[PDB]
Design a protein around this motif. Structure first.
Motif, PDB file in Angstrom:
ATOM      1  N   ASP A  64       0.831  -1.206   0.000  1.00  0.00           N
ATOM      2  CA  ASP A  64       0.000   0.000   0.000  1.00  0.00           C
ATOM      3  C   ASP A  64       0.871   1.265   0.000  1.00  0.00           C
ATOM      4  O   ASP A  64       0.518   2.283   0.605  1.00  0.00           O
ATOM      5  N   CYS A  65       2.002   1.191  -0.707  1.00  0.00           N
ATOM      6  CA  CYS A  65       2.922   2.323  -0.815  1.00  0.00           C
ATOM      7  C   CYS A  65       2.259   3.485  -1.550  1.00  0.00           C
ATOM      8  O   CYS A  65       2.456   4.647  -1.193  1.00  0.00           O
ATOM      9  N   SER A  66       1.481   3.153  -2.583  1.00  0.00           N
ATOM     10  CA  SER A  66       0.790   4.165  -3.385  1.00  0.00           C
ATOM     11  C   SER A  66      -0.128   5.018  -2.516  1.00  0.00           C
ATOM     12  O   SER A  66      -0.294   6.214  -2.766  1.00  0.00           O
ATOM     13  N   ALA A  67      -0.715   4.392  -1.497  1.00  0.00           N
ATOM     14  CA  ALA A  67      -1.617   5.088  -0.585  1.00  0.00           C
ATOM     15  C   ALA A  67      -0.893   6.228   0.135  1.00  0.00           C
ATOM     16  O   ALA A  67      -1.502   7.255   0.443  1.00  0.00           O
ATOM     17  N   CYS A  68       0.408   6.041   0.395  1.00  0.00           N
ATOM     18  CA  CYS A  68       1.205   7.060   1.074  1.00  0.00           C
ATOM     19  C   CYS A  68       2.139   7.742   0.083  1.00  0.00           C
ATOM     20  O   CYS A  68       2.575   7.129  -0.894  1.00  0.00           O
ATOM     21  N   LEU A  69       2.434   9.011   0.346  1.00  0.00           N
ATOM     22  CA  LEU A  69       3.318   9.785  -0.524  1.00  0.00           C
ATOM     23  C   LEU A  69       4.238  10.676   0.304  1.00  0.00           C
ATOM     24  O   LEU A  69       3.774  11.571   1.014  1.00  0.00           O
ATOM     25  N   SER A  70       5.545  10.426   0.194  1.00  0.00           N
ATOM     26  CA  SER A  70       6.539  11.210   0.924  1.00  0.00           C
ATOM     27  C   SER A  70       7.174  12.248   0.003  1.00  0.00           C
ATOM     28  O   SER A  70       7.726  11.900  -1.044  1.00  0.00           O
ATOM     29  N   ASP A  71       7.088  13.519   0.402  1.00  0.00           N
ATOM     30  CA  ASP A  71       7.654  14.609  -0.393  1.00  0.00           C
ATOM     31  C   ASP A  71       9.167  14.452  -0.516  1.00  0.00           C
ATOM     32  O   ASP A  71       9.841  14.095   0.453  1.00  0.00           O
ATOM     33  N   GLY A  72       9.688  14.724  -1.715  1.00  0.00           N
ATOM     34  CA  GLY A  72      11.128  14.614  -1.971  1.00  0.00           C
ATOM     35  C   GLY A  72      11.790  15.980  -2.172  1.00  0.00           C
ATOM     36  O   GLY A  72      12.903  16.061  -2.699  1.00  0.00           O
ATOM     37  N   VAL A  73      11.101  17.042  -1.755  1.00  0.00           N
ATOM     38  CA  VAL A  73      11.624  18.401  -1.895  1.00  0.00           C
ATOM     39  C   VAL A  73      11.245  19.254  -0.679  1.00  0.00           C
ATOM     40  O   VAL A  73      10.153  19.112  -0.124  1.00  0.00           O
ATOM     41  N   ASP A  74      12.163  20.135  -0.289  1.00  0.00           N
ATOM     42  CA  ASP A  74      11.944  21.022   0.852  1.00  0.00           C
ATOM     43  C   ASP A  74      11.365  22.354   0.382  1.00  0.00           C
ATOM     44  O   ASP A  74      12.051  23.142  -0.274  1.00  0.00           O
ATOM     45  N   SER A  75      10.095  22.591   0.719  1.00  0.00           N
ATOM     46  CA  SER A  75       9.410  23.822   0.329  1.00  0.00           C
ATOM     47  C   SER A  75      10.109  25.048   0.913  1.00  0.00           C
ATOM     48  O   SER A  75      10.220  26.081   0.249  1.00  0.00           O
ATOM     49  N   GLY A  76      10.572  24.924   2.159  1.00  0.00           N
ATOM     50  CA  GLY A  76      11.254  26.024   2.838  1.00  0.00           C
ATOM     51  C   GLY A  76      12.510  26.447   2.080  1.00  0.00           C
ATOM     52  O   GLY A  76      12.810  27.640   1.985  1.00  0.00           O
ATOM     53  N   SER A  77      13.235  25.462   1.546  1.00  0.00           N
ATOM     54  CA  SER A  77      14.463  25.734   0.798  1.00  0.00           C
ATOM     55  C   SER A  77      14.172  26.589  -0.431  1.00  0.00           C
ATOM     56  O   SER A  77      14.944  27.494  -0.759  1.00  0.00           O
ATOM     57  N   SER A  78      13.056  26.295  -1.103  1.00  0.00           N
ATOM     58  CA  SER A  78      12.665  27.040  -2.298  1.00  0.00           C
ATOM     59  C   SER A  78      12.420  28.506  -1.958  1.00  0.00           C
ATOM     60  O   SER A  78      11.834  28.819  -0.918  1.00  0.00           O
ATOM     61  N   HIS A  79      12.874  29.397  -2.842  1.00  0.00           N
ATOM     62  CA  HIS A  79      12.708  30.835  -2.637  1.00  0.00           C
ATOM     63  C   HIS A  79      12.716  31.564  -3.981  1.00  0.00           C
ATOM     64  O   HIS A  79      13.456  31.190  -4.894  1.00  0.00           O
ATOM     65  N   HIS A  80      11.887  32.606  -4.084  1.00  0.00           N
ATOM     66  CA  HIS A  80      11.794  33.392  -5.312  1.00  0.00           C
ATOM     67  C   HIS A  80      11.382  34.827  -4.991  1.00  0.00           C
ATOM     68  O   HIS A  80      10.540  35.057  -4.118  1.00  0.00           O
ATOM     69  N   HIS A  81      11.985  35.782  -5.702  1.00  0.00           N
ATOM     70  CA  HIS A  81      11.683  37.197  -5.494  1.00  0.00           C
ATOM     71  C   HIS A  81      11.958  37.988  -6.771  1.00  0.00           C
ATOM     72  O   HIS A  81      12.916  37.700  -7.494  1.00  0.00           O
ATOM     73  N   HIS A  82      11.107  38.981  -7.041  1.00  0.00           N
ATOM     74  CA  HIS A  82      11.253  39.813  -8.236  1.00  0.00           C
ATOM     75  C   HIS A  82      10.586  41.176  -8.038  1.00  0.00           C
ATOM     76  O   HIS A  82       9.815  41.367  -7.095  1.00  0.00           O
ATOM     77  N   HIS A  83      10.894  42.114  -8.937  1.00  0.00           N
ATOM     78  CA  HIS A  83      10.327  43.463  -8.869  1.00  0.00           C
ATOM     79  C   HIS A  83       9.626  43.813 -10.178  1.00  0.00           C
ATOM     80  O   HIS A  83      10.119  43.488 -11.261  1.00  0.00           O
ATOM     81  N   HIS A  84       8.473  44.477 -10.063  1.00  0.00           N
ATOM     82  CA  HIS A  84       7.695  44.876 -11.237  1.00  0.00           C
ATOM     83  C   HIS A  84       7.410  43.674 -12.134  1.00  0.00           C
ATOM     84  O   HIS A  84       6.920  43.883 -13.233  1.00  0.00           O
TER      85      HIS A  84
END
Length: 109
Positions: free
Chosen positions: A89-109
């Motif tokens: 029943d592995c399909s039933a569970c899903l473990s994230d493989g990426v850190d959302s906190g690590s991700s970052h983005h910023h821009h102007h106009h």
């Protein structure tokens, strides 16, 4: 079962024959058992065919076998494996493989 335990049961001379099944060195054979090496999808199959009673490709890689042989695994999920209830029943569970906190983005106009 696992190679570590399976080999443990085997004798020094007997184990040699086992390595022959995979066509690998006696030291290498034990590497996968220890976990200090990488097991290829083809190699995983060798052990399963080598014993076909103790160590199976699923045992070697219970998490990756579902990725390496998903077509086969798909068949048991359908519910045809009602003969015996095996963990999964592995399909039933899903473990994230990426850190959302690590991700970052910023821009102007």
């Amino acid at each position: 079962m696992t190679l570590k335990e399976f080999i443990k049961s085997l004798r020094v001379g007997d184990a040699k024959k086992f390595a022959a099944r995979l066509g690998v060195s006696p030291s290498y054979l034990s590497q996968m058992a220890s976990g200090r090496t990488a097991i290829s999808p083809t190699r995983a199959l060798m052990i399963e065919s080598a014993t076909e009673g103790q160590v199976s490709r699923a045992e070697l890689r219970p998490h990756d076998w579902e990725l390496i042989w998903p077509e086969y695994a798909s068949g048991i999920r359908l519910g045809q494996t009602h003969v015996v209830h095996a963990e999964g029943d592995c399909s039933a569970c899903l473990s994230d493989g990426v850190d959302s906190g690590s991700s970052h983005h910023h821009h102007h106009h």
